[PDB]
Design an enzyme around this catalytic site. Structure first.
Site, PDB file in Angstrom:
ATOM      1  N   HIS A 156      12.429  41.085  -3.107  1.00  0.00           N
ATOM      2  CA  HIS A 156      12.987  42.358  -2.649  1.00  0.00           C
ATOM      3  C   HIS A 156      12.345  43.520  -3.405  1.00  0.00           C
ATOM      4  CE1 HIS A 156      15.805  39.459  -1.158  1.00  0.00           C
ATOM      5  NE2 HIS A 156      16.706  40.342  -0.760  1.00  0.00           N
TER       6      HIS A 156
ATOM      7  N   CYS B  48      -1.907  43.219  -4.941  1.00  0.00           N
ATOM      8  CA  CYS B  48      -1.005  42.438  -4.093  1.00  0.00           C
ATOM      9  C   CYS B  48      -1.772  41.920  -2.902  1.00  0.00           C
ATOM     10  CB  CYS B  48       0.272  43.188  -3.683  1.00  0.00           C
ATOM     11  SG  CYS B  48      -0.007  44.951  -3.360  1.00  0.00           S
TER      12      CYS B  48
END
Length: 133
Positions: free
Chosen positions: A48, A77
């Site tokens: 999250h 990422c």
């Protein structure tokens, strides 16, 4: 899309996404913030977005320790450019004592494709209040 890891700040901070073994070669510190998966290496798997806030003092501390050692630091990422941009912005805000607007603008100007979520932007607003208190 890119052209290899992108130098986004003068203090040798690089932004990228899912590098190869060959593309990790020039780096001294690596921060991987992707959800799933020589020398200093860090991996955070936040499921999250709301979870980043608790890791901001540590993460920005890690980046700053890299620059103090005059080292090449890669933050990546996949694909994905929200959390890593947020992280870099949080670093600029704290260690260059700049506003959220200026920090975002600096990174934006250099890495046009970034878009942190509104969730992460509010996280950065929260971070600013914590810096000014």
């Amino acid at each position: 899309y890119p052209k290899g890891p992108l130098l986004v700040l003068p203090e040798k901070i690089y932004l990228y996404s899912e590098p190869t073994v060959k593309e990790l070669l020039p780096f001294d510190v690596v921060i991987n913030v992707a959800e799933e998966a020589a020398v200093e290496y860090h991996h955070y798997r936040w499921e999250h977005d709301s979870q980043i806030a608790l890791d901001l003092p540590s993460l920005t501390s890690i980046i700053h320790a890299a620059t103090t050692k005059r080292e090449k630091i890669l933050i990546h990422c996949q694909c994905g450019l929200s959390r890593s941009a947020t992280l870099i912005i949080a670093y600029i805000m704290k260690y260059h004592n700049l506003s959220l607007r200026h920090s975002y603008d600096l990174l934006k100007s250099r890495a046009d494709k970034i878009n942190p979520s509104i969730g992460l932007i509010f996280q950065l607003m929260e971070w600013e209040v914590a810096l000014n208190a």
